[PDB]
Write a protein that binds this ligand. Sequence first.
Ligand SMILES: Nc1ncnc2c1ncn2[C@@H]1O[C@H](CSCC[C@H](N)C(=O)O)[C@@H](O)[C@H]1O
Ligand SMILES: Nc1ncnc2c1ncn2[C@@H]1O[C@H](CSCC[C@H](N)C(=O)O)[C@@H](O)[C@H]1O
Ligand SMILES: O=Cc1ccc(O)c(O)c1
Ligand SMILES: [Mg+2]
Ligand SMILES: [Mg+2]
Lengths: 242, 238
Amino acid sequence: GPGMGASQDDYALIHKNILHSEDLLKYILETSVYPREHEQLKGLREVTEKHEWSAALVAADEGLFLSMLLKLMNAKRTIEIGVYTGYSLLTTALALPEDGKITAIDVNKSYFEIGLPFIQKAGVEHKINFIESEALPVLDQMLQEMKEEDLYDFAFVDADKPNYANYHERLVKLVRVGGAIVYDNTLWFGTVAFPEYPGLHPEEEECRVSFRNLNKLLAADPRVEISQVSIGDGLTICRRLY
Amino acid sequence: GPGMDDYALIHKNILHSEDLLKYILETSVYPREHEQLKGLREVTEKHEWSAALVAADEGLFLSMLLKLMNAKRTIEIGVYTGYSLLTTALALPEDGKITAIDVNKSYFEIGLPFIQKAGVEHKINFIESEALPVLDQMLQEMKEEDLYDFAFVDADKPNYANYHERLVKLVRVGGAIVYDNTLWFGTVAFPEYPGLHPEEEECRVSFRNLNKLLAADPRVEISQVSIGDGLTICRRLY
Ligand SMILES: Nc1ncnc2c1ncn2[C@@H]1O[C@H](CSCC[C@H](N)C(=O)O)[C@@H](O)[C@H]1O
Ligand SMILES: Nc1ncnc2c1ncn2[C@@H]1O[C@H](CSCC[C@H](N)C(=O)O)[C@@H](O)[C@H]1O
Ligand SMILES: O=Cc1ccc(O)c(O)c1
Ligand SMILES: [Mg+2]
Ligand SMILES: [Mg+2]
């Protein structure tokens, strides 16, 4: 619609970090992440760092953390909501077993096609079923077709932040009991800690309010147990109880 | 000796402000913290070594990790008043079993009433000893059927690398080894750091050596996580 520009340059928060020290973040990346980062993940990240929406790219240390969760819980079928150039998707496909399957959802397939050659060189494209659509209609259609034996083990939500609570209502029924739902960016550059934060783009302010509401909802939701983790831009792990 | 304290690292917060950390604790931790964990934490904050108490948001994450991997047999090295131990016992199933090792049982007795009131004392086998002899004796007695699903290391920091050599044999393949404090209050990010107590400086040097060792170790895959004082999760590959 008409109005204000909403590109990455129009945002105010992209350079703000949740860690106190930029040196500490760089130490973590150079000591414990890059030596453990798949060669195709490196290439995918380096191209994405030059893309016009580079700030949306998931943090590399968070990527290795998501991989660790997937392997430790022996995930086999996963769903990803928000693919962009595919760094978390390629991370997920490399973590799953040979016969693992991923449902990847994003409104923009041209983003996915930037990383697709790296995913192909890694040899894990066969695991991925990409769906070019808005996530919410796809999730609602799944609620009409998916049977108990096909529930997902793991869900990574990293798409349009104001819709997280809406995705949550579907994902607590699409993920198996004891499965995991991970919401990205639940600390939103640290702005969630304040009731009001000046100097934000309208979309950044909307995400601050939605995340402040989401973090309260998730902490009070009896259907899941949660753990908020201050890695990357913050994430919240949910484990379905019933 | 009496003819010879005063430390620099007391407050755990690697986030950009006190406000952000307090927001996480009040919004996402305290409403999910067990009441006996709350009682244990509040009395431990009055203890003279309260700086050693595990970060509460880090404890909730340990609980999440134990359930997601369905751990049943765990080992903890470094108990103190027992916050992470009680966190573990509350997360395991009713038949879960924990081997808890610490050199000082008087610390463990501070949290034992809370563990008992929580009804999970039956899951814990506490061993008052230095951990390295106990682990070495485990390497001669334990069989493949008795391997641990999960290990939490939170004891004397310069011994972490030595613990690692034992635990990559005592934790099952695909099991987890978790090390607390691998970011050591942020000090590991610098080759030199001024004004540290000699013991705090020795831990900084050891963690810088440990972090490089773990990242080069082909026996495990790692993930270092900037939560609390930093933790490194290790998954045994073979
Ligand atoms: N309503 C919607 N439904 C599905 N995808 C959406 C959406 N709104 C935005 N998106 C997509 O969500 C993505 C968020 S960026 C995601 C980052 C990516 N997971 C990584 O690892 O780096 C964008 O690619 C955007 O196209
Ligand atoms: N060599 C050793 N073997 C076993 N435990 C040791 C040790 N050296 C120190 N410790 C113990 O390790 C503990 C570190 S403090 C650990 C904090 C605790 N895990 C929590 O949840 O808060 C101390 O209680 C100390 O007594
Ligand atoms: O001994 C000091 C200390 C400080 C912080 C810790 O997390 C810990 O385990 C020990
Ligand atoms: Mg994100
Ligand atoms: Mg510690």
